[PDB]
């Protein structure tokens, strides 16, 4: 039933499908932008990390993020900005022991999971141009139709 795994790649995800990414390291998980008003990059932080500056490559630039993780689970930090000129800030956080992150393009919005597993839930983000939001995925990933979102939710919160 499950479509994947797909190799890391760059493409424009179709409307109405969940992209489910299997993180495998403490780097950038994915970067997403439409190059007009929406830039999101998600960074993985391994458990038990005392506050520290780390350097990440996002959208072709070297950026320094102050980062922390007191949990025994992994933290996936959504870093967002709406213009190349603003600094990134941590918009949302997903705390997970399954290392799965999800993103959906639907109904003019970007949907992702946040909170802590196994009770993580979806939240939405606005944009002036949803269709052109493209993504660079640095891990294996799966494609799941929105029709089977309950299945995507189960994965995010319990594993594959």
CA distance 108 to 77: 23
Q: How many residues bind its own copies (CB under 8 A)?
A: 47
CA distance 69 to 131: 34
CA distance 20 to 75: 16
Residue matched to tokens 């039933």: 1
Neighbours of 60 (CB within 10 A): 6
Cβ–Cβ < 8 Å for 18, 149: yes
CB nearer to its own copies: pick between 61 and 72: 61
Out of 17, 76, 113, 142, point to the residue binding its own copies (CB under 8 A).
17
Query: Angle at CA 46, nearest 5°, toward 109 and 67?
Result: 70
- Letter string b/e over residues 121-143, b meaning 16 or more CB atoms within 10 A of that residue's CB: ebbebebeebeebebbbbbebbe
- Residue 13 as a binder of its own copies (CB under 8 A): the answer is yes
Q: Least distance in Å: CB of 128 to its own copies?
A: 4
- Residue 102 as a binder of its own copies (CB under 8 A): the answer is no
Out of 68, 132, 154, 158, point to the residue binding its own copies (CB under 8 A).
132
- Residue 113 as a binder of its own copies (CB under 8 A): the answer is no
Q: Least distance in Å: CB of 72 to its own copies?
A: 30
CB nearer to its own copies: pick between 106 and 118: 106
Out of 24, 84, 121, 158, point to the residue binding its own copies (CB under 8 A).
84
- Residue 92 as a binder of its own copies (CB under 8 A): the answer is no
> Which positions touch its own copies (CB under 8 A)?
6, 9-17, 31, 33, 35-37, 57, 59-62, 80-86, 89, 91, 106-109, 126-132, 134, 136, 143, 145-148
């Amino acid at each position: 039933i499950l479509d994947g795994p797909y190799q890391p790649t760059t493409f424009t995800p179709p409307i109405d499908y969940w992209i489910l990414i299997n993180s495998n390291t403490n780097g950038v998980v994915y970067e997403s932008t439409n190059n007009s008003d929406f830039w999101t990059a998600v960074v993985a932080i391994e458990p038990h990390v005392n506050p520290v500056d780390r350097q990440y490559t996002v959208f072709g630039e070297n950026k320094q993020f102050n980062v922390r993780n007191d949990s025994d689970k992994w933290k996936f930090l959504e870093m967002f900005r709406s213009s190349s000129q603003n600094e990134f800030y941590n918009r949302r956080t997903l705390t997970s022991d399954t290392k799965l992150v999800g993103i959906l393009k639907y109904g003019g919005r970007i949907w992702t999971f946040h909170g802590e597993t196994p009770r993580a839930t979806t939240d939405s983000s606005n944009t002036a141009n949803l269709n052109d939001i493209s993504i660079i995925i640095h891990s294996e990933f799966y494609i799941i139709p929105r029709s089977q979102e309950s299945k995507c939710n189960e994965y995010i919160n319990n594993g594959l």
